[PDB]
Amino acid sequence: MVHYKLTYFNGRGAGECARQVFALADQKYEDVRLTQETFVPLKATFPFGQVPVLEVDGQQLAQSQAICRYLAKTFGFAGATPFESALIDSLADAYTDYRAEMKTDVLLPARTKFLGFITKFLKKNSSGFLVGDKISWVDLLVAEHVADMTNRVPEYIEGFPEVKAHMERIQQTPRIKKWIETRPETPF
Amino acid sequence: MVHYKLTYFNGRGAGECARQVFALADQKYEDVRLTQETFVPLKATFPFGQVPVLEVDGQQLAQSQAICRYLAKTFGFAGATPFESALIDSLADAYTDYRAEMDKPKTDVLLPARTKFLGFITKFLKKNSSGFLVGDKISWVDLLVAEHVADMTNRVPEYIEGFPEVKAHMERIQQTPRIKKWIETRPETPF
């Protein structure tokens, strides 16, 4: 059988979306979790000296969004058409920009900008997903962040009811909900 | 016929890889180059308040790399298999990281950053006999890398010293007839 190994740290972080894509797919994988200590001397073994790295039948693929997208396309969670896939990619790029800009003072104004943009996509889509009529990897990516932020800073969601509903919808999807219940509890 | 409009500033910048995909595909498109002054009233109309934005038959798609990957898949420049396309993606994302890292700046940030990044790029080149980064055919990440390398080497001749394979790649890509033609004919801009 095809063999998937995902190497990351012992935390959600940049490895989590890939993990949730596997969960959605009901796909078995090897979940390898490194500590800072054991990672650092292994750096040269990875394509760009960083984690996460996926191995598919032993072949390495690095970079979190490249890994998520690859797995999503493999399992059917990257949109229905090429333009849908591209729209999902654009939202995921917008996310990475928003993360970079934070970088109370920084978290609030970053999120009103980003969540305003997200909300536009949600309101024009009757399905409840960000793009098209089916769950995608960017839904996972965004819902997980929003849950995380709302967990740490409860007023994160205030003023964004469509975004709240989306977070709840995605995180209650049976295979995601299960994964969230069963995954290792980590500070990040 | 399918109608493509690319909106960006009057420069290479974040719009150029898309322009070069179009060139490579011999696809006509509307190349809209805004001034800051005409951009201001248009900002609210873009998906994330920024450019570049592509319209395909009037439907907007924002974000540089999303645009390039889309165009590249449309036209056949995103690898031969799903895994190739993911490797290409991984290189473009490594590029992005490198750009984040990078006279005084030359020596303090540029050259260190480029040693690390060009080392990674060189490893990909030297394991592939074709002369491309991934697979046996040109892809959009070849375009993105070669353009950056050309640009930096224009600014800082020593950029390419130590990286002959990267230079060779830059020249191969930029002499590809449709790309050469575009480079010869594009507006000359400071960025």
Write the layout of secondary structure elements.
Two copies of one chain form a homodimer.
Chain A: E1 4-9, H1 16-25, E2 30-34, H2 36-39, E3 53-56, E4 59-62, H3 64-75, H4 82-101, H5 107-123, H6 137-152, H7 161-172, H8 174-182
Helix pairs in contact in A: 1-3, 1-6, 4-5, 4-6, 6-7
Summarize the structure in words:
2 copies of one chain form a homodimer. Chain A is an alpha+beta fold. Chain A has 2 domains: 1-75 and 173-188, 3-Layer(aba) Sandwich (Glutaredoxin), CATH 3.40.30.10; 76-172, Up-down Bundle (Glutathione S-transferase Yfyf (Class Pi), Chain A, domain 2). Chain A contains 8 helices and 4 strands; from the N terminus they run βαβαββαααααα. The first copy, chain A, has helices at 16-25, 36-39, 64-75, 82-101, 107-123, 137-152, 161-172, 174-182; strands at residues 4-9, 30-34, 53-56, 59-62. Chain A has a 4-stranded mixed sheet with strand order 2-1-3-4. The first copy, chain A, is globular and about 45 Å long. Chain A starts with a strand and ends in a 6-residue tail after the last helix. In chain A, 38% of the residues are buried. The interface between A and B is medium-sized, with 31 and 30 residues. The PDB classes it as transferase. The entry lists the keywords transferase. The assembly is dimeric.
